[PDB]
Design a protein around this ligand. Structure first.
Ligand SMILES: Cc1ncc(C[n+]2csc(CCOP(=O)(O)OP(=O)(O)O)c2C)c(N)n1
Ligand SMILES: Cc1ncc(C[n+]2csc(CCOP(=O)(O)OP(=O)(O)O)c2C)c(N)n1
Ligand SMILES: [Cl-]
Ligand SMILES: [Cl-]
Ligand SMILES: [K+]
Ligand SMILES: [K+]
Ligand SMILES: [K+]
Ligand SMILES: [K+]
Ligand SMILES: [Mn+2]
Ligand SMILES: [Mn+2]
Lengths: 375, 329, 375, 329
């Protein structure tokens, strides 16, 4: 009986403010308990052994790499690092639910997605060292990864800027009849940025095949969520934009996989956004765990044991150390590369600046650390 | 020289560029606030009916979203032509332009880019626009390596420069002088053609002084050249810069080596304005040829006023007086 | 039993996405029907006759002013105008519920708030004409009003920028122990901007005494709300930020007053934000009506009639025309005033620019429209 | 001359300024991301425990909100000291700074203002910060009438300039060179003192050439002056600009009239950089005194690189070589 274009609603004849439900919020979806036991048989994805072992080995290999590169940072061998501790389950559980060619936008804390997609150890290292093997040409801070082959858009420091971008790539995919979905990861702190409000609204009104994947680890650097928002986390925001939303246990690789798998299926079929808020806890910020929960599961199915755990711990340390040795011995790229790719074609005036550097180094090069730069 | 032409005003020339782009590039889409019905300056009239609602469409009212979304379309390789409704309102998107679009190719080692993005926006004074309908923000963007900024002076120039921006493999901001949208028409080819970026145009040869401007202010300096000839017997070389970055240093310096005197004019405020970059560069390259200090005749260092507009703008009398003093230096 | 810091919730053992309720949204609060009849006696505010007559006269005087200045714009006597048609009830109903000294931030379409606060007709006109009586010194586009005496912050064109500002003024008021509330008006289109997400979240986490008042008229220029958002308007967004929220019939001056009155009481007592979404329809954008509904109400109480309506229509036209004649005959401010207030003190370099203009006008002044500028 | 001093590094001097401000101005509050526990560069250590959670507090992660909120506090007359965690991240707030804060007093006819707002933010290169931990955005803000932009070179200068910004009746951006936060300490008065805005400081008199810089780059040009004296027998006048806008035109021009030669240096990219404004202004005012073209030795026109930082920055060898050529012109 109300006729207003802005909303579809009835009249009410008494004044009643709508109260938020924060104390009893959106419940947390969980598939396996802390002992790795399946709680509800109808929800078990019954992933095959080789796939569940890949989830496990990807998480642990990431953890092995993290320990070594974190030490490398402490010694000043690389200028920065930040670990994935506690996030390994959200990474690998969601990546396993995607198509290989689904495009990923991330925030900075999803090396496990690249790991699941078989990104070489040499290439994680090359970016952290800024060596000649880095396809990023040593230009970004360490732990800024990207891979065009594996459909993983280069990560950038400014928080949340990837969120409206991811929506545009999803709109483009829709037009291309891609049958592809975009996933976009961000933390609960980044969800406070204006660009998150932009991306969430655009994806709904432009009907885009996108999964918004918020990792809520309770902290943004020193800021607890009590200072970050006052509604019921990020999941409760989704319905206000018209977005189907769910909250999952981010320490449960199966809950993450199931929610991501179903979000992907429906996003691609229906051209509509889905929001998944995965609850974790930031175990490490920069320079009841998903791995142990999955280990307990494996040890039930009879698919892992102490002998295997020992051998894999050895093999993964050896692979990480081989990559690390190679990364440290590679030279850095030619200093000329600081000038290319600013535009596709270097402007004549930028070429002039390049030439001026080359002249400068001719005369003053003894003063520059040219030892381990290429050419 | 370019096939059949019609008289077009500058809004019509922008529609013509956009129509030609849609026709020949099936990936291209146009989006922004109120573009579906044809836009608040009529630049997108007819395009949605012609090309489809999926290709010419309205966004929510959120400039940071508009640019971020356009970047995302371009990351997939599709041509993204975003509109910002007035250049005064581009600032919410400044972080997506400067920290994201401009740095996208460099920071990925060319694994990803957003070269197929163009942002177009009405620009410059309009008689009564006051603080937020009048701005010319080009100097803010000029200090950002990785983007191109382009400003036409006429309908013919607009269509040819806009087609070049849309086709250029770098994110481009195309500023359309709004006070020219319904001003005098001129003949514009119906089919596509391009005018090169980073190329100034000498529109009148002269031997005593070089005058440089862009957008509407080109017409002001053309009139100043006439006043100078008639009143002072002074020969002015009149140059339209066209591309603010990367700019055509060689055309400007070659002219100043010849004349020995340079006056640059723009509606934007003096301090930090783009005349500051042209003057300091010409000074470095043409020092020994300079007969008089390089003059900058610009808006005052204030916000852009409503009732005082006629007193604020660097009009032909302000430019002429500056020129007179420079000739007499 | 979940222990995550980011949310307070139970576990759930089955995958269920949370669906938005858009088809049956938040209902629309209404006090009087289209015939001006009170629907629910317990909700009638029983405002006294003099106050209800002030609501009516403020709305109609605004409407009289609007018709004349809209004509003035069509003739090119002023450079721009935009009317308040259909919004008069939201303006006056909310302003009547505020304290005189509550601070107002607005969007551009709330001249009725100033009208209710007895802003002189001469001063609305002075701003539209940019004449010497304008305390804004003729610097802004017409229909950009401000009044420090009446606690109405100068309106600016960029949409939604006032929303986080209003929250900061409310935080400051809280500290000052003001017992004052801030109200901040914006349209449903402006609510798509990033600054709206900023203001709504900050007001909740910083516990600010602020009323967010969204006018939802179904359109933002040419854009219908179907292209603006896909959730249940703006009211449904409030709970996601932890904000108490309500939707009202914006054509019903009593529903608007009651919701604003109760939001103000609770915001100031509890230091918490309130969101009111008033549903209207944009009757006019720039260069079942609230007035007729209130007229029907008056005509019931026996408090108005045709004789009174005629006399008031006459008196209000005369007052508007007196102000209009005066506004047109005033000179514009001295051109010197384009340079002051850029900083509190004019920088020596800016003074030099002022002096250069004064010299210029000495020589070239015949070329400038100096006729009706002061000095 | 200013009472008891202690050795303070630049972060400690900022804490000292902020503590003095809180103590003497009961309206003042400090807010931003992670300021409560003391900040990611320790600039707010101890202040919340000392002054209260209502006065030193964390905001949500939203720069446009931080600035908008700070504007709102200042509209009520209360002192608002907002932090942006790295200057690279100020761009989301560009529209609130340029369209709102800078224009607030002008557009209301002085009915309202936000003069009691200061935005402080770490700034400049740090060895390995790459694209988003290294930026020096001052030229973007220099083209905005209505804001002041201030950059100190040392702990003493920082505390005195920050107190002046906090007390100035105009919205001010105070950029703190982060590579100096834990560098050498110097003696800093414990009690409040002020250094004037829009005033350059000649820190070494000289007669052959004027060198101008700000922030860390002041120490680079001081070393260049030493290299010039020792290697070339050249006397350099070394000037710290301190305030980018409104800048001290008179101090710079008076020096260039004396020496006849000017070299300006900054870490920001060359094109559209603030050296462009200084050079073109000095050229206009000192034309007849100029013995050689004014030199600008700046970062290259690229984003700021990680591994290539040592090759990107306008270091003492780059400045010295430029100076050598200028002396020989
Ligand atoms: C626009 C912007 N502001 C500030 C920062 C500095 N910063 C880097 S991480 C971070 C906290 C991010 O929190 P969240 O989004 O929750 O991610 P998490 O680190 O918890 O995974 C901040 C403030 C940034 N990178 N970008
Ligand atoms: C940042 C910005 N973008 C664009 C505009 C141009 N504009 C002026 S009004 C308007 C529609 C506003 O819609 P809404 O907020 O619903 O208010 P209404 O006009 O319906 O009252 C637009 C896009 C603006 N003023 N500011
Ligand atoms: Cl990071
Ligand atoms: Cl407006
Ligand atoms: K990012
Ligand atoms: K392009
Ligand atoms: K506004
Ligand atoms: K200040
Ligand atoms: Mn977090
Ligand atoms: Mn509207």
């Amino acid at each position: 009986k109300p006729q207003f274009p802005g909303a579809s609603a009835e009249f009410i004849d008494k004044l009643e403010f709508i109260q938020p439900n924060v104390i009893s919020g959106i419940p947390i979806y969980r598939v396996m308990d802390r002992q790795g036991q399946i709680i509800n048989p109808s929800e078990d994805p019954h992933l095959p052994k080789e796939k569940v072992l890949k989830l496990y080995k990807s998480m642990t290999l990431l953890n092995t790499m993290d320990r070594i590169l974190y030490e490398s940072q402490r010694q000043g061998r690389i200028s920065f690092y930040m670990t994935n501790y506690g996030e390994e389950g959200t990474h690998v559980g969601s990546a396993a639910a995607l198509d290989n060619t689904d495009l990923v936008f991330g925030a900075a804390r999803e090396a496990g997605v690249l790991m699941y997609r078989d990104y070489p150890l040499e290439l994680f290292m090359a970016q952290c060292y800024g060596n000649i093997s880095d396809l990023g040409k040593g230009r970004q801070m360490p732990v800024h990864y990207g891979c065009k082959e594996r459909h993983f858009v280069t990560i950038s420091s400014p928080l949340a800027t990837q969120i409206p971008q991811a929506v545009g790539a999803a709109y483009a995919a829709k037009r291309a009849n891609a049958n592809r979905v975009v996933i976009c990861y961000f933390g609960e702190g980044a969800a406070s940025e204006g660009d998150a409000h932009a991306g969430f609204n655009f994806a709904a009104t432009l009907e885009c095949p996108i999964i918004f994947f918020c990792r809520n680890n309770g902290y943004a650097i020193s800021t607890p969520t009590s200072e970050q928002y006052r509604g019921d986390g990020i999941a409760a925001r989704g319905p206000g934009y018209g977005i189907m939303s769910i909250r999952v246990d981010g320490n449960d690789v199966f809950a993450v996989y199931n929610a991501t798998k179903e979000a992907r299926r429906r996003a691609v079929a229906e051209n509509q956004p889905f929001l998944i808020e995965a609850m974790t806890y930031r175990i490490g910020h920069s320079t009841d765990h998903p791995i142990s929960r999955l280990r307990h599961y494996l040890l039930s199915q009879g698919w892992w044991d102490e002998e295997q755990e020992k051998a894999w711990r050895k093999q993964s340390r050896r692979k990480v150390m081989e990559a690390f040795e190679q990364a440290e011995r590679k030279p850095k790229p030619n200093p000329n590369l600081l000038f290319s790719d600013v535009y596709q074609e270097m402007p004549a005036q930028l070429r002039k600046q390049q030439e001026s550097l080359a002249r400068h180094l001719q005369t003053y090069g003894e003063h520059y650390p040219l030892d381990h730069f290429d050419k | 020289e370019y096939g059949q032409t019609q008289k077009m005003n500058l809004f019509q020339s922008v529609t013509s560029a956009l129509d030609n782009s849609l026709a020949k590039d099936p990936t291209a889409v146009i989006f922004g606030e109120d573009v579906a019905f044809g836009g608040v300056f009529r630049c997108t009239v007819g395009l949605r009916d012609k090309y489809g609602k999926d290709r010419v469409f309205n966004t929510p009212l959120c400039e940071q979203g508009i640019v971020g979304f356009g970047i995302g379309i371009a990351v997939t390789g599709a041509t993204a032509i975003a509109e910002i409704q007035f250049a005064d309102y581009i600032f919410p998107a400044f972080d997506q332009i400067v920290n994201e679009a401009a740095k996208y190719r460099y920071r990925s080692g060319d694994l990803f880019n957003c070269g197929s993005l163009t942002i177009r926006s009405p620009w410059g004074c309009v008689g009564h626009g006051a603080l937020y309908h009048s701005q010319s923000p080009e100097a803010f963007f000029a200090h950002c390596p990785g983007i191109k900024v382009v400003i036409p002076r006429s309908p013919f120039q607009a269509k040819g420069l806009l087609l070049s921006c849309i086709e250029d493999k770098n994110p481009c901001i195309f500023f359309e002088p709004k006070i020219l949208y319904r001003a005098a028409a001129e003949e514009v080819p119906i089919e596509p053609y391009n005018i090169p970026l980073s190329q100034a145009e000498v529109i009148q040869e002269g031997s005593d002084v070089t005058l440089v401007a862009w957008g509407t202010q080109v017409h002001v300096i053309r009139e100043v050249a006439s006043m100078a000839k008639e009143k002072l017997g002074v020969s002015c070389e009149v140059i339209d810069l066209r591309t603010i970055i990367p700019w055509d240093v060689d055309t400007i310096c070659k002219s100043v080596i010849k004349t020995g005197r340079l006056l640059i004019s723009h509606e934007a405020p003096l301090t930090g304005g783009f005349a500051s970059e042209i003057s300091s560069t010409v000074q470095e390259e043409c020092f020994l040829n300079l007969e008089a200090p390089i003059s900058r005749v610009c808006g005052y260092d204030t916000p852009f006023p409503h009732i005082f507009e006629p007193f604020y703008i660097p009009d032909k009398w302000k430019c002429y007086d500056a020129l007179r003093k420079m000739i007499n230096y």
